[PDB]
């Protein structure tokens, strides 16, 4: 019913492996266009068993990246400073290169994490957050690192652990996480199953909280958290 | 003819916005103030006032943050302090000091009495009102929030009352039209008000808000980061 197909050149994609994977399976429109908030809620439920609370807020902020009244394209979501942030797991900082497309060299840090284990977990996820921020601080003179970016980065790490793995423990098989990022594909052939446990603020926040404590974080002085309001 | 004024009944929801409240009171928006989508705001702003989508779409997307629903808000949701609703309102009390939702004559007194001895409000009077209303909040509200975000919104709101009740090009409005708009949330059609024949856009509003800004004698509160409260 929902086969994987690589996006063609008319097919718009985002910096989000979550939404890109849903589009690549037709849970969202395969062209990544004309997406409403209710379409996000239904796709997150259908693909991942993610519940509306977190999706509705993310989607309302996503709408700010679009000139349209009540839809965005996946490509709109690249707008730097709305949701898109520096120290991404698999994308370059906007200031240093391409903030939109999967990049293997950036992904290397997450790929190689939890060395010697068959899983990623909260400990490895925190170490990756720390290493990816340190890389941005070392190479990007324009890095934006406030409470807003940090909260989002901990919830994004909670999402990859939760959707590709176990939503209760935040432990995920490495091969599922690698396919999710590298191919934006549900690893069904490799044994991945949609969570039987609803994924909610109440499951994600405890995981994001533990990842937070394992990240050793401090905000940049002199930066006010902000949501860029227009493209 | 198709859009008569009716006072809201006791279960009709209203906002801190005379703009949206007036549209609801004429049925350009649902008279009950419920189930408002972004397209409904765009159509109502066009139909009532000849206001174009650019500014309405952004305001409505931020308004959605005040609602727990996927793609609608009520007019009453928009009272959420720190999303759009701000201190030093023209016609409402600060959230910290009282009622941030309902029209209040004692607050409105400053705008009512502005440009003394003239029959119009204009950019100069609008700036003096912004200065006096912020001075009042700084004096009486220990919790006043006064950043570039609240100031920009306050200048655009004053550009809106001048533009919709008056001349969208000059930002001059008849005092009578402005007083009816705030006090009754009614289009003063009986008293001679006509919908702009000139589209009201970011390009007409921003120059007026800019000149109101320069006439406001404004400075930000220094320790405060601009923020949009993301949930109720
Ligand atoms: C449905 C479940 C979701 C999952 C599992 C998910 C997962 C993720 C993950 C793991 C990242 C990190 C990518 C990286 O750092 O390289 C990410 C980033 C992002 N997501 Fe999502 N996401 C979801 C929903 C959403 C929604 C609803 C929106 C917006 C409407 C959104 C917008 C973004 C954006 C703009 C980024 C880029 C942040 C950055 O710069 O890395 N996501 N998402
Ligand atoms: C359509 C034309 C509009 C006009 C002419 C207009 C006009 C105004 C005016 C003059 C005020 C100031 C009230 C005061 O300070 O006492 C105001 C406040 C407000 N407006 Fe609007 N508005 C419009 C559209 C909107 C839209 C689309 C939204 C939200 C979706 C909105 C939300 C608000 C809010 C929340 C306030 C309260 C701010 C405060 O004083 O604390 N307005 N509006
Ligand atoms: C994440 O996985 C790693 C690797 O399995 C865990 O760290 C190891 O924990 C074992 C089991 O107690 C220790 O004996 C090893 O010495 C640890 N190795 C390293 C390099 O850390 C880690 O505990 C896991 N984290 C969570 C929250 O489950
Ligand atoms: C707004 O209206 C006021 C009052 O009419 C204007 O200020 C007056 O301007 C006249 C003629 O230019 C001066 O001679 C008066 O002394 C001013 N009166 C007061 C009360 O100050 C003001 O210029 C108008 N502003 C704009 C931008 O049109
Ligand atoms: C997820 O982890 C919990 C807690 O260890 C476990 O009981 C549950 O069976 C796991 N879920 C699946 C489907 O494996
Ligand atoms: C209007 O809004 C509420 C949510 O606040 C919804 O549950 C209700 O069904 C809607 N009613 C109509 C008539 O659309
Ligand atoms: C100011 O805000 C704080 C935090 O919300 C609140 O507890 C306090 O009562 C407020 N103080 C005044 C005088 O409004
Ligand atoms: C608005 O002001 C302009 C510039 O003075 C004027 O030419 C125009 O006619 C005014 N509009 C109306 C309907 O009076
Ligand atoms: Cl961008
Ligand atoms: Cl930048
Ligand atoms: Cl590691
Ligand atoms: Cl970190
Ligand atoms: Cl299969
Ligand atoms: Cl902005
Ligand atoms: Cl109605
Ligand atoms: Cl409130
Ligand atoms: Cl307050
Ligand atoms: Cl005055
Ligand atoms: Cl908030
Ligand atoms: Mg990024
Ligand atoms: Mg107010």
Numbering used by the authors:
A (entry chain B): 9 to 239
B (entry chain A): 8 to 239
Paper excerpt:
A recent survey by Faiza and co‐workers explored the diversity of UPOs within sequence databases and was able to identify two major groups of enzymes: ‘long’ UPOs (Group I), typified by AaeUPO, of approximately 45 kDa molecular weight, and ‘short’ UPOs (Group II), typified by the enzyme from Marasmius rotula (MroUPO), which are of approximately 29 kDa. In this study, we have cloned the gene encoding an ‘artificial’ short UPO (artUPO) close in sequence to MroUPO, and expressed it in both Pichia pastoris and E. coli.
We first crystallized artUPOyeast and determined the structure of the enzyme in two forms: the first in space group P212121, to a resolution of 2.01 Å and the second in C2221, to 1.21 Å, with two and one molecules in the asymmetric unit, respectively. Superimposition of the two, non‐equivalent, monomers in the P212121 structure give an rmsd of 0.21 Å over 231 C‐alpha atoms, suggesting that they are very similar. We cannot exclude the possibility of cooperativity in the mechanism of artUPO, although the kinetic plots presented are not suggestive of more than one phase in ligand binding. The structures confirm that each is a member of the short class of UPOs as defined by Faiza and co‐workers. The differences between the active site tunnels of artUPOyeast and AaeUPO‐PaDa‐I are also noteworthy. artUPOyeast is distinguished from AaeUPO by the replacement of characteristic phenylalanine residues in that enzyme with smaller or hydrophilic side chains including I91 for F121, L65 for F76 and K156 for F188, with G195 (common to AaeUPO and HspUPO) replaced by L163. Catalytic efficiency for the UPO substrate 5‐nitro‐1,3‐benzodioxole (NBD) was largely the same for both enzymes, and the structures also revealed few differences apart from the expected glycosylation of the yeast enzyme.
